[PDB]
Amino acid sequence: MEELFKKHKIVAVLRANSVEEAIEKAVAVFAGGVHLIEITFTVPDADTVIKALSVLKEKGAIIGAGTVTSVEQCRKAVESGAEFIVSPHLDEEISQFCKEKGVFYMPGVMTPTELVKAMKLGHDILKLFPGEVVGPEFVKAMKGPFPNVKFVPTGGVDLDNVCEWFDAGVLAVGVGDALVEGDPDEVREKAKEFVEKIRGC
Amino acid sequence: MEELFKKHKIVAVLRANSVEEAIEKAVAVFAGGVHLIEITFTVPDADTVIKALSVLKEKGAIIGAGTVTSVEQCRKAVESGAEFIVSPHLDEEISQFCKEKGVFYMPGVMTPTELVKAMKLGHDILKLFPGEVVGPEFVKAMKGPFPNVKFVPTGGVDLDNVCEWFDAGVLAVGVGDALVEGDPDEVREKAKEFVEKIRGC
Amino acid sequence: MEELFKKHKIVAVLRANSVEEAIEKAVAVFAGGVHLIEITFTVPDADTVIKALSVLKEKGAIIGAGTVTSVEQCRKAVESGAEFIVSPHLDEEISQFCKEKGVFYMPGVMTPTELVKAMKLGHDILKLFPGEVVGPEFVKAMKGPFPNVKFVPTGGVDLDNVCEWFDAGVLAVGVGDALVEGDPDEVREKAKEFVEKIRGC
Amino acid sequence: HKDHETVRIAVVRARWHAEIVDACVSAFEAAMRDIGGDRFAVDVFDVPGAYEIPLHARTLAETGRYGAVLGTAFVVNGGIYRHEFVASAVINGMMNVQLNTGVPVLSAVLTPHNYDKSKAHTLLFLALFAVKGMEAARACVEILAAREKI
Amino acid sequence: HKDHETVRIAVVRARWHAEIVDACVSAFEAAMRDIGGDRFAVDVFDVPGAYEIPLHARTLAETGRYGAVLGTAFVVNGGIYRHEFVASAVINGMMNVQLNTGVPVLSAVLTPHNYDKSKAHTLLFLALFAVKGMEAARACVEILAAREKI
């Protein structure tokens, strides 16, 4: 995943109340230019969604799963072909599971202590969450003591401030409702807007 | 070179009356964001320039040589570490030499016949020259019969129309005086302007 | 084909992503007054299109194929009933194949050298391509040294300048998107506009 | 003996809009020769219209003289009455025939969205029918051969 | 003897829009392995289109070599003619076949509201078909097993 985050600079985060909904959004998002897609594991039958969207892998899509809180959930995300696992928090059992399986893992943090625990376990790319609390200021401040740490914030990110997040030093930004909510045609247009805005900064 | 052209979308073309001049421009250009640099083989003591600038390879510079009209010239460009060779015209002796040496070769064309002869010899990336005569219109027209041919035009390219060249389907653009002429500080600013303009389109 | 080019003064050039699309355009174009239709050989299943449109031959349509780059492609164009073959460039293997089969061949040129090679092989009607680069000026200039050479330019031709091409001495003009793109009803109206504009000059 | 027998194919074609329906049939016959390689031969029969195809095609299919049957017609909205009732009965008819006889029946009965017999429409359908003819010939050879693999 | 026999499943798939139809079939096959546990095995057959599925599927069902048959296709509005006549004949055909043979026939023949072959539409259907494949595999195992309980 390291190359991919650098290459695309954006991850779509999907939420849906159904399999069909998750697919329509994934396609609108993908069709609109976002290649890295995170499926929250909490989508009813997310496992179906993760596996069904494996068809987009041959078109250059990268399909993974988020909101993973346990190893049992990880196992299913892996079973369905998740490229990566993202947790709300750093979790040692998730991390060890992921290392054994060979699936990329990104733990969540909010403070230097949490950041460091993740560094000490070999994770130099962190989910910053909520980005709504810490902001681009946190990301920039962290570069002093942790110049080798990359972030992918979730929340607090929109097309209005995505460039601030990049000026601060993020690796990529995760984008939620601002990118994925609305009619699939609206979603596709939003994906183009996010890609173009990031392209320019 | 295939990855590099896609990655950077610009090649600086250097001309100088001295070794020191060529170095100052190469550095201003490189420092300003252009990684692919073509040194015309006609720079007095170009061989010195090509070899001296090998130091920038460890900083991510790609150093090659242009205006190659013969295999003897190619041999020296290769001896000095050229990554690639660019000729004013398709030349079978240059092409065969380059294949034997493992140095990337880009032949020059202006018409479909010349284009095809190059395709038949295995060269799908062509120097389009002068771009001043054929324009972005040629590049676009060629995609009909030759959808798999990539161009890197030289001449007829400035920051004013670089996006037209890209809309037409070029792979990368070579840039001459518009990018490399003037005080090394002016050159560095111009390199930033070209990179940013291409970044945006 | 010699009589036909003189008689109609226009050739439609079709491009399509499907068989049905190619047919609808061919019919709109034909119904609108253009009898000479060139089907690019690159239409997916062009062979089906070429053969299916043979039904229009009994209505006075002339069906041939363009963008031919090889003899294998020619063989299929001939197998399907192409009246004529048009290549992006002069090609001796295509020419010899066509002579043996009795199918009219029109080679592409851009310079006097290419023009002459075609004359020396017996081809006095040439595809001028891109017309976007050479223009009506080339066509007129060529009449000095080559008073017996006829051209059918492709590209650089629209209803806005079709009469300039004729003042310059072209035999016929090929017309691309300006004639064939849009809704089949729009296409039919465009065909009428091109025929009437040529009729008047 | 060694199976070098010609497969016999029947085509049943409606006489309405014959210029179009026959475009399909002619293309079909040519394609059968191009694909079949003389392993196949085709006989053609006329029928007043699409409506009678299921009985004519069946009379023939139950005779055992054909490996397969292609039915064809151009069924259009005359602007007077709804043609859908017949088109429905005919497609269901042909489906039932192949399921009653064991002889595949191919459908080349078209029900266009719009056909006003304009210059462009006539020309369009002549070409589209020729395409369907070619497709049907391919389908014929492949389905006949495919059932032989069971 | 002890029943440790593999249940044989046939899949009959249309060649039109194969990229999409095959998405379903591939997902189906994978799901059958995931659910079946090698208690099931699947053979796949091609058919020109949805139209011929009821006879091909039946020829096969009446052979007694399969426990169940899955028919699949993507039937779309080509913008030229009404596709509903065939779609109706085909769904009724498959329904009649399972009622004539005693071999359940599953339907994975889709008739979408809209499909213009746009980038988004193609991608959407590739994924939706993969989902239907997985659902069909589950339905297959459960219905086959359910009829065994009577």
Residue numbers in the entry:
A (entry chain A), B (entry chain A), C (entry chain A): 691 to 891
D (entry chain B), E (entry chain B): 6 to 155
Q: Which text from the study accompanies this structure?
A:
To generate building blocks capable of displaying native-like Env trimers, we computationally docked the crystal structure of BG505 SOSIP.66434 to a set of trimeric NP components with exterior-facing N termini. An early screen for the expression of several of our designed nanoparticle components fused to BG505 SOSIP revealed that the trimeric component of the recently described NP I53-5030, designated I53-50A, secreted at higher levels than any other scaffold when fused to BG505 SOSIP. To further assess assembly efficiency and structural integrity, we performed single-particle cryo-EM analysis on BG505 SOSIP-I53-50NPs. After several rounds of two-dimensional (2D) and three-dimensional (3D) classification, a final set of ~3600 projections was retained and reconstructed with icosahedral symmetry to a global resolution of ~4.5 Å as determined by Fourier shell correlation. However, because of flexibility in the linker between the two domains, the SOSIP trimers are poorly resolved; they appear only as diffuse densities surrounding the well-resolved I53-50NP core. Two discrete unfolding events were apparent in the thermal melting profiles for BG505 SOSIP-I53-50NPs; the SOSIP trimer components unfolded at a lower temperature than the I53-50NP core (72.5 vs. 82.0 °C, respectively). Specifically, the stoichiometric values for PGT145, PGT151, and 3BNC117 Fabs, close to 1, 2, and 3 per trimer, respectively, confirmed that the SOSIP-I53-50NPs present 20 antigenically intact trimers per particle. Finally, we also observed a markedly lower binding of BG505 SOSIP-I53-50NP than their corresponding trimers to BG505-specific mAbs targeting the immunodominant 241/289 glycan hole (RM19P, RM19A1, RM20F; Cottrell et al., manuscription in preparation) and trimer base (12N). Thus, bNAb epitopes on the SOSIP-I53-50NPs from the apex down to the CD4bs are highly accessible for multivalent interactions, but this is not the case for some epitopes further down the trimer near gp41 and epitopes at the trimer base.
Here we describe the computational design, production, and in vitro properties of self-assembling, two-component NP immunogens that present native-like SOSIP trimers of several genotypes. We recently reported the computational design of self-assembling protein NPs constructed from two distinct oligomeric protein components. This property makes it possible to express and purify each component separately; when mixed, they assemble efficiently into highly ordered, homogenous icosahedral particles ranging from 24 to 40 nm in diameter. We used several techniques to show that we have produced monodisperse, icosahedral NPs that assemble in vitro and present 20 native-like SOSIP trimers in a well-ordered geometrical structure.
